[PDB]
Amino acid sequence: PTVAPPAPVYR
Amino acid sequence: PKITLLTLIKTAEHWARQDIRTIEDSKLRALLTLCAVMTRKFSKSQLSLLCETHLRREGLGQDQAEPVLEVYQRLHSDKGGSFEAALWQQWDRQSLIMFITAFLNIALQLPCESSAVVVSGLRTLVP
């Protein structure tokens, strides 16, 4: 359906 | 079994203490629903605190606050599991696992309401 936000980036 | 508020919390307690990296996709999908349902048991005011705690515990930078808060906000207002389904479709398994485990471990320790009047009153009732 929609557009999910990006997954959290670990750094 | 009936999905009462108590059962929901006990289920969260249980899965919070599991290593979910090897579980089957069907159970991982159900855990996403658990996180979504559980998110909706927090007042809207507590979502920023949920986000801030998620970042702090996971060691994420402030630049990750926007997408993390967005996940919590959009789960909180989700209708018919639309956003929840989008997360499942569009995120990789490792991201889902890490977000789910992070949430389950913070959710049981954060207050679900923010008003001092609510919190102070309810504390007088706790055994």
Residue numbers in the entry:
A (entry chain F): 602 to 612
B (entry chain A): 140 to 266
Q: Can you quote the paper on this entry?
A:
Viral protein 30 (VP30) proteins are present in all filoviruses and perform several important functions, but homologues are lacking in other negative-sense RNA viruses. Additionally, VP30 binds RNA in the presence of zinc and associates with the viral RNA synthesis machinery, which includes nucleoprotein (NP), VP35, and large (L) protein that contains the enzymatic activities. EBOV VP30 (eVP30) is critical for viral transcription (mRNA synthesis), because it is required for initiation at EBOV NP (eNP), the first gene of the seven gene genome. eVP30 has also been implicated in regulation of co-transcriptional editing of viral glycoprotein mRNAs and in modulation of viral transcription reinitiation. We demonstrate that eVP30 binds directly to eNP.
